[PDB]
Paper text:
In group B (tracking strand movement, 45% of A-D particles), the DNA tracking strand is pulled out more than the guide strand, deforming DNA locally at SHL2 and SHL3. SNF2H adopts a canonical open conformation, identical to that of ADP-bound ISWI and with similar density for the bound nucleotide,7,8 indicating that group B structures represent post-ATP hydrolysis states. The other group B structures show gradual conformational transitions in SNF2H: relative to the B1 structure, SNF2H moves further outward in the B2–B4 structures, with the brace helix moving away from the nucleosome. By overlaying A1 and B4 structures, we can visualize the extent of lobe 2 rotation toward SHL3 and the outward rotation of the brace helix. The lobe 2 movements pull the nucleosomal DNA away from the histone octamer surface at SHL2 and SHL3, with both guide and tracking DNA strands displaced outward but to different extents: the tracking strand is pulled out by ~6 Å in group B structures, while the guide DNA strand is pulled out by ~1–2 Å in B1 and ~3–4 Å in B4 structure, concomitantly with the gradual outward movement of the brace helix. The dissimilarity in the tracking and guide strand movements results in DNA backbone deformation and base tilting at SHL2 and SHL3, which is necessary to accommodate the 1-nt difference between guide and tracking strands. In the B4 structure, the DNA phosphate groups and bases are in an intermediate position, in between two canonical positions. To accommodate this positioning and local distortion of the nucleosomal DNA, histones H3 and H4 undergo rearrangements, with several alterations in residues in loops H3 L1 (E76–S86) and H4 L2 (A76–T80), which interact with DNA at SHL2.5. For example, the nucleotide 28 in B4 is in a position between those of nucleotides 27 and 28 in the canonical nucleosome. This DNA change induces an inward flipping of H3R83, which interacts with DNA phosphate at position 28 in B4 structure, instead of position 27 as in canonical nucleosome structures.
Numbering used by the authors:
A (entry chain D), B (entry chain H): 27 to 122
C (entry chain A): 37 to 133
D (entry chain E): 38 to 133
E (entry chain W): 166 to 363, 377 to 430, 443 to 634
F (entry chain B): 17 to 101
G (entry chain F): 22 to 101
H (entry chain C), I (entry chain G): 10 to 118
The structure:
Amino acid sequence: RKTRKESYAIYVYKVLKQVHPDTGISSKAMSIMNSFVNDVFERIAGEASRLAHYNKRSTITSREIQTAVRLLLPGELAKHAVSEGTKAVTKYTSAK
Amino acid sequence: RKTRKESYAIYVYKVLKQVHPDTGISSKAMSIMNSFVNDVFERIAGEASRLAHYNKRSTITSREIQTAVRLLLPGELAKHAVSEGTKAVTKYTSAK
Amino acid sequence: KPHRYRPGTVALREIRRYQKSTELLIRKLPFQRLVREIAQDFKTDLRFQSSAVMALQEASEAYLVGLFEDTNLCAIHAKRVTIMPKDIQLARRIRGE
Amino acid sequence: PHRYRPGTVALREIRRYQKSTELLIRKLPFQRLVREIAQDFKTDLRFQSSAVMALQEASEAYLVGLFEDTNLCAIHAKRVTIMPKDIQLARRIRGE
Amino acid sequence: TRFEDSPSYVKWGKLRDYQVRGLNWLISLYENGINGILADEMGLGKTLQTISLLGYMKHYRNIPGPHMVLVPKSTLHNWMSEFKRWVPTLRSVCLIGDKEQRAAFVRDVLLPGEWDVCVTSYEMLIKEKSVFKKFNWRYLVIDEAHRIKNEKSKLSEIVREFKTTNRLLLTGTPLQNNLHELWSLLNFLLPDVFNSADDQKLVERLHMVLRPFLLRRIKADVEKSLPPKKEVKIYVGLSKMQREWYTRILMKKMRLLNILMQLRKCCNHPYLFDGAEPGPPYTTDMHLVTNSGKMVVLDKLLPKLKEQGSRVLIFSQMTRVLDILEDYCMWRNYEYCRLDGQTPHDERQDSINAYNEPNSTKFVFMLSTRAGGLGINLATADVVILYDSDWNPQVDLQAMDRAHRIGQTKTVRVFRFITDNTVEERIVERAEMKLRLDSIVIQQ
Amino acid sequence: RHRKVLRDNIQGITKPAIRRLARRGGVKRISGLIYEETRGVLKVFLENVIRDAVTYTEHAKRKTVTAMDVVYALKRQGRTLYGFG
Amino acid sequence: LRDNIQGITKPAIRRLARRGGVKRISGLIYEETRGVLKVFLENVIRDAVTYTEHAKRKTVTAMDVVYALKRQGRTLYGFG
Amino acid sequence: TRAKAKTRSSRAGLQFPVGRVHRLLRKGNYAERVGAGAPVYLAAVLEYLTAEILELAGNAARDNKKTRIIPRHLQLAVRNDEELNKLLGRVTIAQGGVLPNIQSVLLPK
Amino acid sequence: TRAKAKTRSSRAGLQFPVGRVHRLLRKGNYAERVGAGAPVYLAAVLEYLTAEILELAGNAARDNKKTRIIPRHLQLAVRNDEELNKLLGRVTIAQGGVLPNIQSVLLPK
DNA sequence: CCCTGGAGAATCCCGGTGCCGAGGCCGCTCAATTGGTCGTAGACAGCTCTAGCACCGCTTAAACGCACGTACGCGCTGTCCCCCGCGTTTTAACCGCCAAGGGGATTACTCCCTAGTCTCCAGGCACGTGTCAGATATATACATCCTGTGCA
DNA sequence: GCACAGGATGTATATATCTGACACGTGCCTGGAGACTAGGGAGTAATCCCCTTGGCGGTTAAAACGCGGGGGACAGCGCGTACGTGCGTTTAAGCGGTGCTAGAGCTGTCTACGACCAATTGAGCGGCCTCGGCACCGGGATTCTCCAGGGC
Ligand SMILES: Nc1ncnc2c1ncn2[C@@H]1O[C@H](COP(=O)(O)OP(=O)(O)O)[C@@H](O)[C@H]1O
């Protein structure tokens, strides 16, 4: 067995079972979803890095992630993504 | 006494006097030249960093810089810039 | 009886004149009012540096000039000399906006 | 004998191929073309089959989008036949 | 031991005692080689004294060389008429008009050098600094010198760059806000004396320093008329909507950028803010009056003066407030004439004449506090109501004296409207501070 | 109680000014319906750019929009501007 | 090899145009589209060969092709 | 002794790996330091976007009378939603095809 | 003892700041390690590009009969040359104007 | 000049095959837990220079409204040739299979190249300051455009 | 019907003036060079086995070719309409001012909490098998459409 490779496949599958309980997915579709997740990650992280360099900071923070999602996603997606991220950070802070 | 701002104005003026002894440059043209140098530097450095990540290396080297130059520059510019940089690195390594 | 130029000589003269210069072709104060009105809906109590408005005007004028070049090409494609909203919409659709 | 008018079969083919999701170029000719083109940059090159498949996917997508824009230009000229002038106009407006 | 009577070169007129005293003082300034500031109030023949000075300097001294007078545009014709009437031996030219007229004038009269005095305006000086900069100027006169009271202004820089031998500043209010302005004027005058930026250590020392360079003749030597004024402060309280908006402004969708400027107008009328007025009907009926303290007091005050002597002048610093007052006066059906910056000059003069017509039905003349030209002879009025106070007390004094001119007959009552527990109290306190500074320094 | 509006700010971009822009673009004849279309196009473009610039200004916790913020918004859009920093 | 742009046949171009949504095709479209295809392929293959060379590989990988496409602004999901 | 380890994804109530996102940020040369809330926020955003796309694709697959999501379903979901089409405008999806569309002039009169 | 300091730009023969480029690379978070010859190569490439643009702009200034360069000359140089036009295709030069260009149809005949 | 009537294509329903998707197991390496530290960012204070709001005064360039005439957009018509739809024959793509070895991919080892540190010093930046290149004006010289008219 | 003279317009041209930005010179300080150490990244060699490439034969779909005809491109003509040109009138831009703040940037400090580094260990995750329900393939009966002929 060669070197192990990392993919978001199991997490994508868990989300799919949450959304449609009795619907599956094929290998090419999972590869497409993995590529999508990697691309979105790189877009957001690069934008946040540029923000930190512009403001002369050294730490990537939740405020930078929020500004990056406002910059990159359009409209209702930006609103809902901001709400979801804020909820997650609130739960993490209170439940840690 | 105000803060220190860094710019490539000194070196741009040197290259201007080297390539056209009797010619001057205005402040706004200097702003444009400075912005151009910054933009090219950022493009080359970003492409080199992406290359290093792709090949799972940690060091930006002259091989990475050459490959980024060939990727970014169109053709005659690419080959002449490669020759210029090879000359420079040879001169630096030879007796320095 | 008074001397008059044909319909199209003055248009070509204006084309050459404004392709020879580099100034801004839009009035600064009206443009500033428009920019402030647009930013009002995004966030009230907004203040603008004067250099920001100049950069905005530069970008807007460059965008409009490039759009008009493409519009003229489309009108010439349709075997016309007059540019039309159809030409503007086609240019935008092909460019992907 | 039965004979369809000039244009009904074209519409049927339009619907059929817009319904389908498979490649429309012969794979062996495309592979030979790719290797030929690659001879200009390096010798004795070898390819992964996935590489040729991805190249074909990208090429087909580019051509399909180009033909859509060309069709729009032809409709603008009040025509149904597409022409090389339409292809050139689409490329020029895109920025190529 | 100087000129003791009306000079001879000045024909058709005998200068008064203060006129000849000022002329003697200017001659002493010239003899000692010191430039001076002449501030003898608003009516003691300052233009005549300047004309007499130039007439003397040309007649009894042989220097008919170039002389420049800088004036506001509104006073150019007055200056030319006075030059032609009093001392016609001198040769005076005026520079006005567009670019073609300016070029023709410079090619016809200015450059050929057949003139002796030049009467130009501020704008024409800024335009033609290039040609005025060439000449050697024997005497430079700047009228209404408070225009250049501020350094770092283009006119002050340009007037500093000229080549001059003598300088003379005419003003009535040398001190408006702070001693920096007085130093700016004195530094234009004597740059080598007042080169520095800045009651034995104060008041008396300042008086002794200023006295060799200044001369003020209060309008009390003549008097014999103009019964003294009387200022009454009327305190008013916020209406309920005014209180609601004051709280909304202080606590903090309308942009509120200049908080002081929003609180002010809020203290004038809540209707200025968008949407504070009631809905689409847009009627003028008793909800204008009741929503403003100044407006309720004004409605309680106007009819009493009207059944009394009437002829009231109302001043404000906002044309929006002028609009609201015009609507009120239309609804109550008094007579109103309006004058602000947007009123064309012919209409301005027509309104002044119509109100000043000996027996007219006009009742209220509304002016913007700064829209006059220091003229405006509204001497038939009786009561001045200041809707708004200005940071500059000299502006308020000029507004007052537009109705306190020589033709006045009966005493004038000045009603100043102040909101209690607002920023108007601050404004008035600052104005009092500036006025006390001015009185202690210049008046004494 | 006196209301009198002046004009719409999008009308401040005038027909002769749009004609000058078309002249620099190289256009000879211009239809009368072009002006409203151009006004809409300009509004859309400005809205995108200003939204991004305001996002940057908010992240910096400022209330003043700067030329650098405008430049960064344009680089986000893909319309690099040289000459302002 | 030589004469391989003629392997992209007229029926294939017709199929691609029919997926694009065109009904009538002029006879001169085929040479034009072969030229367009050649220039596009040359750009992509050049970038991919640059990546392959830098890695000191003698094989071109789907990763190299994807990287070239992404640098040209033509992201391709479905291969990695 | 040490308490039972609770994953940060469990603490945040997510289904995406917060720790893996944190390691990817640290190894990516994006910035010198990474805050604690950044991985949680990023994982939540990724989860939301993935859920949106999967929901639309599953709806499309059901309208096709299937049960496995294929690239055709993904492409239909992306191109029939305006926000996701604005996000993925420069993206080509393998074996996705195109949206059925014929211009009205081409239809028979 | 000690030797007199020689700048790396002098060592390499470049008119661009090798040391400043090295520091900018190390602070830009591009990688955790930067080689010795990389700043030299990058500075040489930047110098070549700047020299090209300045040569073309000086030629344009001679054509316009002025001895100082302005953004108009920079735009005329960047356009009219295909390599730099591809390089700066999506770049706007402030007050640079546009190329003179009138279509053949629009001319009188 | 739309209504039946044939034909062709597509759709739906029903039954047999195969192939991987989804589950269950194993092993490992990577994230979570504690503990300690340090440096980054938040908070405060003190200067300086710009931007917003409400006005005024003046000059003048540009917008604006209007009217006329003229290219031009647009519809209509006729002609011709070109692209499409169909049938026949050829060709090479596809698929399955086999075979060989080139190169991708991993591991172990060692060295050499870079990060970090401390001095030392000179190159680059802010600051003043003069002079000259370009903008502008003015008066010509010339090149262009348009019309009327003389000549077939 | 065409071609030219000439008038009027606009434009290119040489000269003279003036001003404000370019370019140079200066002090000093902050960042770059010199010299050293220490450690981990990467170059280098060697092994494995996967995946590429080459070849061959049989099938059959797809390409190439040729025919015949209707529809679409395209040239030409006529018209009336909306845009260009020019002129007189109106408006608002632009410049120069008041008067007061607050906002934001550079300086300089202080300080505390949050991120980093390190050491353990055990649970999550990736790879490997295995099996059955879905997807695919065919087949048959069905519905919708498209084209043609004429009694509507
Ligand atoms: N014949 C006159 N001689 C001198 N002064 C006069 C004469 N007539 C009127 N005045 C004064 O002129 C004043 C108004 O004119 P003003 O513009 O102030 O002139 P000046 O600027 O010369 O004082 C009045 O107060 C009046 O006293």
